[PDB]
Amino acid sequence: VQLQASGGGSVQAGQSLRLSCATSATSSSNCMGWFRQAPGKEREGVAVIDTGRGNTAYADSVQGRLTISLDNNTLYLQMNSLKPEDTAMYYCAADTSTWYRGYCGTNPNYFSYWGQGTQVTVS
Amino acid sequence: KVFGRCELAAAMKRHGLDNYRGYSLGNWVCAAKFESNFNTQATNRNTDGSTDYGILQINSRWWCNDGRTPGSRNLCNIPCSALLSSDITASVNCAKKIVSDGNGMNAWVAWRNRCKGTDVQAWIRGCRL
Numbered sequence A: 001v002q003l004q005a006s007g008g009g010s011v012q013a014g015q016s017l018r019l020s021c022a023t024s025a026t027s028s029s030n031c032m033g034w035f036r037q038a039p040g041k042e043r044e045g046v047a048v049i050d051t052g053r054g055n056t057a058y059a060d061s062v063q064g065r066l067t068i069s070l071d072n073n074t075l076y077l078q079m080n081s082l083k084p085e086d087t088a089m090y091y092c093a094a095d096t097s098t099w100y101r102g103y104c105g106t107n108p109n110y111f112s113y114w115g116q117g118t119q120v121t122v123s
Numbered sequence B: 001k002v003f004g005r006c007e008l009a010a011a012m013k014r015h016g017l018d019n020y021r022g023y024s025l026g027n028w029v030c031a032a033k034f035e036s037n038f039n040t041q042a043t044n045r046n047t048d049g050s051t052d053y054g055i056l057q058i059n060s061r062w063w064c065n066d067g068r069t070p071g072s073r074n075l076c077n078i079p080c081s082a083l084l085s086s087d088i089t090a091s092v093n094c095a096k097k098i099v100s101d102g103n104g105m106n107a108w109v110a111w112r113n114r115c116k117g118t119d120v121q122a123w124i125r126g127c128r129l
Helices: B005-014 B025-036 B080-084 B089-098 B109-114
Strands: A009-011 A017-022 A031-037 A044-050 A056-058 A066-071 A074-079 A088-094 A118-122 B043-045 B051-053
Touching: A017 A088, A017 A118, A031 A066, A031 A074, A044 A066, A044 A074, A056 A066, A056 B043, A074 A088, B005 B025, B025 B109, B051 B080, B080 B089
Parallel strands: A009 A118
Antiparallel strands: A017 A074, A031 A044, A031 A088, A044 A056, A066 A074, A088 A118, B043 B051
């Protein structure tokens, strides 16, 4: 159940969805986030949050529509005003605290941990 | 500009990154792939208000000046805009300073996670340098 994403669904554009994932977050990670991936495509960073400070950063494509939050131990991704372009598999990720990180970024390659994904389809 | 793999390998070799501080050329090409996907114009915001710039996603917290990251440094003594050029000179020169700052290529988180300890030579295989 660790880092298992859920909340996905098939909806009409304009509607909302709320993705969730279980954590166990401020001790084993410096950063947590969400990335998405379309069939045969590369992972795309969506949102990131600094586990200690709570500071966030977003990809230009989701700025103002998606919100990442941490209820230290659950990670959330509120998706408002969904667009057809948001269609993809969503995963929640985390990095390792064994390496110092004074800040966080959305690049999926900045996270070595993630779990099962959840499908988001918007028509 | 979005570099081709071999196109970037050749440019990085000409700019003296092959074996710089013991890091073979493939390490640098691999780092660029996972940091910027070879896009010289890539910019990504960090949670502290700083931003990562260019082919090697060099940050404004310590390395370049973008004028919007309060209390930061500009160790490479360059405007972050210089790191967004199609010519990789500024990015390479700054990268050479970064890699000697004490943590080697570990400064690049994407390199640490996707490249370090892998067959990085594969990134320059078949390329005319």
